[PDB]
Amino acid sequence: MRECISIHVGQAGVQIGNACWELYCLEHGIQPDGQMPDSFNTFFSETGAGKHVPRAVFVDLEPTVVDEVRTGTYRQLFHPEQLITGKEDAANNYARGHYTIGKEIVDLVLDRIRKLADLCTGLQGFLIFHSFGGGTGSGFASLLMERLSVDYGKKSKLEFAIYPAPQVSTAVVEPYNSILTTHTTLEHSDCAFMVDNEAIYDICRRNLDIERPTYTNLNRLIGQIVSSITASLRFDGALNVDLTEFQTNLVPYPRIHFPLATYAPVISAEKAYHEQLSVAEITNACFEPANQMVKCDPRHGKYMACCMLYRGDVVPKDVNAAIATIKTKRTIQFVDWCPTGFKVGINYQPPTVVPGGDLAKVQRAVCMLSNTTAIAEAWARLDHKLDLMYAKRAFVHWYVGEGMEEGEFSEAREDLAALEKDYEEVGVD
Amino acid sequence: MRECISIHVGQAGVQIGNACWELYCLEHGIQPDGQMPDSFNTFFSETGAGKHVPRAVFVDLEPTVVDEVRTGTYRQLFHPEQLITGKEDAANNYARGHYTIGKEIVDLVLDRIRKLADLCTGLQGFLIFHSFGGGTGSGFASLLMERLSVDYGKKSKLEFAIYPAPQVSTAVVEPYNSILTTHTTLEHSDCAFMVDNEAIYDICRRNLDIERPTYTNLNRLIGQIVSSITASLRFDGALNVDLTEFQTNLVPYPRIHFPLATYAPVISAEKAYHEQLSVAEITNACFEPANQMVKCDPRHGKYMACCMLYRGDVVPKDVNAAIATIKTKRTIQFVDWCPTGFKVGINYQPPTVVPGGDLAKVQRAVCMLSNTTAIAEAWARLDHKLDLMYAKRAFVHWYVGEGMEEGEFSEAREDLAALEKDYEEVGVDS
Amino acid sequence: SIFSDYYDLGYNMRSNLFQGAPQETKSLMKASYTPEVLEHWHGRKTDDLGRWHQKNAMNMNLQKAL
Amino acid sequence: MREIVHLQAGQCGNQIGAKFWEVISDEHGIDPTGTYHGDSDLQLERINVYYNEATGGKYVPRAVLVDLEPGTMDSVRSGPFGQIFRPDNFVFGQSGAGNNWAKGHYTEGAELVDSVLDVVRKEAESCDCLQGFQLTHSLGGGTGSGMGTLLISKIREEYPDRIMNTFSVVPSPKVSDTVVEPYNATLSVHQLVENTDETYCIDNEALYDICFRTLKLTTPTYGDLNHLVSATMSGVTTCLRFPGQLNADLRKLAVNMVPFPRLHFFMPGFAPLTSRGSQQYRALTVPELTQQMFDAKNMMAACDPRHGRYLTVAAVFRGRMSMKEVDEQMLNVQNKNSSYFVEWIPNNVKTAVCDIPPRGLKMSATFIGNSTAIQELFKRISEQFTAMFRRKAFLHWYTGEGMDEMEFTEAESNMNDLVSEYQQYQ
Amino acid sequence: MREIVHLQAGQCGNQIGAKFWEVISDEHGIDPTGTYHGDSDLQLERINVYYNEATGGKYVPRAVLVDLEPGTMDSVRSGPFGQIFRPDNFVFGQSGAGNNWAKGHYTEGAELVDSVLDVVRKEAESCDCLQGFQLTHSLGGGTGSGMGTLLISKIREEYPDRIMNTFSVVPSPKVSDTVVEPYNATLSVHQLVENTDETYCIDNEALYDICFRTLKLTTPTYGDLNHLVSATMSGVTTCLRFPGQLNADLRKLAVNMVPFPRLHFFMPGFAPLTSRGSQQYRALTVPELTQQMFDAKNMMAACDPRHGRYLTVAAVFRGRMSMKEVDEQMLNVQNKNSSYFVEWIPNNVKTAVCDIPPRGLKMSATFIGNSTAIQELFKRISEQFTAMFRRKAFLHWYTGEGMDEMEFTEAESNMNDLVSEYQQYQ
């Protein structure tokens, strides 16, 4: 009944979705062709054939990454009307994805979202998979937020975004398109899950004992965390955490809504052969600074609100035992004005592993979301990165040439300045 | 519940640990895979599938003794994280392996004893295995002692170290390595155990019928000795000793903590077919000086404290007879202050014969610990060895280059001189 | 005899000084430590009430910590 | 479907494009008859980018092929892949320009730009979406610089949003094939700066160095020369045509590769270059590719990057590989040499990965670079021009067909503006 | 890992190294093609100490080959195991050296030492960790002692904290092969006392006496001499590649053996040497091995240790053992020979027992000595220098290269200095 709509924007979003929907089909009985040989309601609309269509919209301005979905092994699952293809790429330019080429295709994807929500009596929120350092994921998505916050009212907006790593970088203009989107998507989102790329490379190098995995092994982990988020909307549990209480716990203020991601049991097959994983050790490994899915130091920051989503075979007694040892650890700096600070969700369905996957069959799984203040450190780092580009009129001609005023660039800097000064203000005693 | 964490630093520690852990897995019913086809709790950890990860921390700066384990028959037994390897060598240098390349990896190994102790319901103390001669076992051991003293604290650090022998020696700078490493055993270690080589060589030569003994035959005896002392935590008896109990009964001073460990019924198969290793005849065999595991002369010193741990079919009634026969003698000469000086342990399980070894099993095995003041007369000779080499400052330039001042040899000499008078002043009394 | 060319090269190599025969030499601890691998007190069989007391010991240790 | 319209001009451009269409038809499995006979299904999914559909399964290429003297056409047509180009694209004249820029630009050049525009505009408007124009010509010649510059001028005043992508052949340092090419280079650089958005610079003797010292060839002909050009020709549009985990088109390189409109002069490279004698001794992976494309003696220009400063740099990969080796060694080449790259741009390396390798190698790459070291070539062209304009050395064969004498001073005064602008960023 | 980069300089060094690499390939089971041939799985986990991985199951060496004459490189490639080497590591001079130390160090080595440094900088960065270096020399000629010292003086200056165990064939005391040998040997030994931590001393008539009066070889070529030298080479680094009881790498040997920063002239030998007819007449064990090790007719230097004092002694053992015989006999030998061993060190002998033996024998040892009998071999070259130099004989072949006549005075000053420090502990 409680059905959610996922929107994938850009090359990164499409490639994340291509691995998340695999495990979405695998966890239920849905075959790649669409057949199954009521828990599947929240993601798969059931037609009368026994064939299930997904509730997702794949949209990209470059057709090159979407045609492999149309000709791949999932060609008979998606609705062909869903996979929206553009004509010309945005090509790392925010203005090309905002004003001129991105303006033509927003009405079609808006109509598709409306017709997908017409068949949705239990609309709860949005699961947006857009990128920050790209062309269409940062520019085309901002128009989508602009339209949905004025057309669909006060609905939940959960972004699973990719943020640029401090060290590993792909484009050379990505500080621009990262800074540009935060001006208007700050007030047009309710929570934003920040994900980098380098920290997950450390995760698959250090915790996973395999060398040279690819983007697929990273998108598999992103699919796993996005599955554990919506575990309480489809399976029975002791304390089900709906999608609405997530932000009742996490976000305190109308301008601090930027939590963090962490997935603890990421061990391999030979590790599962030897070490047994109960609740306490995976809760301890969850709070490790180096197990984080973002390159940041959590000890510098202060946690403000955290929620735990336990999955599999757990009993509540040692869940309540395991969080008490976190209260007495002075190394973890909790904030002085949140004495409760915790939320617990339980599901009885154990996590599943894809065939040919990287993880192994485990019995317990914990996924962590926490509003911290190290994200302000990451934002100050990106602000310093961008500040050594506007000093001498660099790369502006691509922007002011195509329908973007030069007066935007001065305002976004001071808007982010107010944002980080507010973020550091609330972290004090 | 009663658990010990083993840290096996250095190549000698790794080889002795391979022998000792083979003995431990043979003592219980654990296959080398990890499956049995509550006595394993001290040295293992039961998992859900029936696996059992041993609680060992195998650390060395070389792969050639650690990956040599990884290709062995116990590759599936050990969790792959605790087989810690390095890149380059300490290379017979206390200074190098303690200051230069030990620093980059001592922050990594310390994160493993933390995870082992987080799985520990109750930890009783550590059991370090290294050697006083080489480079890793003298610098890394000192770093481990100081870091565990800062970190954990009020535990019972057992130290099973291998001493340089008076006559047989391999390294040249091994007096330099052995003298320097006493600055953490004296302060930051709460108990210790010297063993030298030539005593084990002579025991294999005379008590055993074997000649030409390889180095596995030494580590098997050391593993039997270490299985004897920790036998009471796994199997207690009529008179059980505890790891925090015998520490208070083996030191009179916070500085005299260097006992001597023997396993009395070392015996062969042709040798032991004729006699009976009874209670009454192996107790005076515990004090035979050529059965001492350290090549020192106990006739020239006075016994100060003692602790005898039996193992197997022992009745308490003739132990008092054995304790009464010893004190009446003239050659076994004691300290005037303490008249009793004896604590006795009883256990009901006989030793486990290793298939492939030489020690044919007896039923009454006794492990013997004695605090003797004669071991200081085996320490002035090492001081003489260091004095004859420090006269013209030989081999010094390879220590002063690695960020350490030349004068620490001299202050080590003052410490050893001030340590000798502690054994001088005891024994003689009003 | 499937490795005859290796031996034919090696002996014609070192028939000048080092004449012998081809063996296989395992390491010493791969020949000593090998697949060769009633019991009074097979364990201190603590059960039920002792397990309850162990959990008690943990629980009031963390309780007096609080 | 992102469409590229190809132009050639001169005996340079005709032969270089002949090898380019050779290797492209080899990659897509297209016969000399024009029919497909390849194996994989991925060679037909974006076949339309470089070829036009025709009946009979014949893929006629989309390129205009023009040169004044028709003696070069008879060499292209009688070649191995000379029967696939349309004869309507075979536009020519009757009198060759013959090493004079002004001959090809004003008097007779005005008499054929209409005839070639009538086929360029005919092929361009039959396109679903148009990406830009890709042109192959010579800088030191007479019919490349003389005439093809007029085509770029006439296109850019008519298609004011399509990208310009030129592969020019600059004069060599120590050997000159013409005697007048300082004039032609000075007159063409001044007109290529305010119009084109992406210019590539290639030289003959540096590629001789490549096929001598690296490929270990015995008799380096012009065929292997043009094959090495065609390797970096095809590698730049290899993500616009094939699938991969992270693709980049020409506009991505344009926006990641220029900081300012007047700094868009590039220089190319090709990474997996090894001889036959060292084939079995090379470990073909990522690390030697990233250490080889960085090497100065693997480049296609006579300017050492040691003397210049890299502003931004692109690197397009090809094949099947993991992506943290890629980015970790881009980090290594940005961190080992901080004196090679500008400190006022945070990230200077652009990467893109395809999936299908070239026919004959497991892994491959293609280096593109905007360096300040290209200022060392233009200052040499200007010093030649000042040594030649000082007494009107060859000027009377230029003003004889209606040139202004003063325009030569404007050409120098706008050429050295590029040198001044590159010098400010060093 | 713990990997060694090899260098071969001069004709003698190249001919010795072409036997060293090729007995090593025998020891690890590598064919002349480069693939695997061995019988055991023990020959591959430590293959990376000497070899580099190549695709296709092939294995290539890690060595740079340097000389001033293409003939020796032709002879190296013409051998049975010459084709395994990479050809881009072959960097050589192409005009002769003249047996001039001055020409091989200043006029001809200065051109070549840059490219050799480039190749060794490429090869040293191809490993995660580098243990140290290895070089084969010849202290009599000019192309194997002129730039090899130049190689070392620009390796210590750039890689300051590693191991260089150079091996040198010292000039003869009684007979000779070049009339300018004392000059080159003194000029090389002036630089081998400053920047080198381990050096070796090899004397050709010791090889001759071993192969005549012990091996009973009627016709000894130079190949057998390099076979003996390479058998000494293989035993030192066996603990790096093969497991054993009491392992000891090169830093172990360095720290134990040489006590002072200057007394590092070694004295190497190989114990189980016997003729064919006497093999079935002797038992094969450690009691006879220690004698054949300590026998001076199994020694590679013509200086009796009876006339001097043994400072420290190493013995790297191989094969199946039982280390009571190893430990107790180094006590027995010191007890009987108390006068020869020094008194201020209690134990002069270090043993290191490995388990995997060389092919052919099970009872193998590598003698390493540090004795004060080196000065009785070094007076015999200081006297030759002081006879040649005082008559002002051969200097214009050195004065013509910018080095003046006074430089030789520091060489003999350091010579008498070294002789003085050897005499302090006699």
Ligand SMILES: Nc1nc2c(ncn2[C@@H]2O[C@H](COP(=O)(O)OP(=O)(O)OP(=O)(O)O)[C@@H](O)[C@H]2O)c(=O)[nH]1
């Ligand atoms: N984690 C992850 N990141 C990806 C993946 N694919 C692309 N990216 C990221 O995307 C960034 C640039 O690609 P995009 O943001 O998708 O570019 P775009 O938004 O599609 O804009 P255009 O390509 O011009 O249409 C890179 O920095 C990558 O880190 C993926 O599969 N997984």
Ligand SMILES: Nc1nc2c(ncn2[C@@H]2O[C@H](COP(=O)(O)OP(=O)(O)OP(=O)(O)O)[C@@H](O)[C@H]2O)c(=O)[nH]1
């Ligand atoms: N029982 C036993 N003792 C050994 C063994 N190997 C070495 N030893 C002893 O170790 C002493 C010296 O220590 P090292 O062998 O250098 O070992 P280390 O202290 O770890 O130093 P490294 O070898 O560099 O790692 C010698 O005197 C030997 O008696 C062995 O395999 N078994």
Ligand SMILES: Nc1nc2c(ncn2[C@@H]2O[C@H](COP(=O)(O)OP(=O)(O)O)[C@@H](O)[C@H]2O)c(=O)[nH]1
């Ligand atoms: N690489 C390459 N260079 C060429 C080829 N043909 C001519 N050139 C170069 O062209 C230069 C001379 O210019 P040219 O082609 O005669 O100019 P044009 O007469 O105006 O077309 C010389 O420097 C040659 O190196 C070719 O097929 N390949």
Ligand SMILES: Nc1nc2c(ncn2[C@@H]2O[C@H](COP(=O)(O)OP(=O)(O)O)[C@@H](O)[C@H]2O)c(=O)[nH]1
């Ligand atoms: N062991 C060995 N020594 C050699 C060989 N060839 C030459 N030598 C020695 O080299 C010495 C002469 O030095 P030389 O090699 O000419 O010096 P170079 O010209 O600088 O390399 C002589 O004393 C020879 O003993 C060889 O094949 N094997």
Ligand SMILES: [Mg+2]
């Ligand atoms: Mg895109």
Ligand SMILES: [Mg+2]
């Ligand atoms: Mg060691």
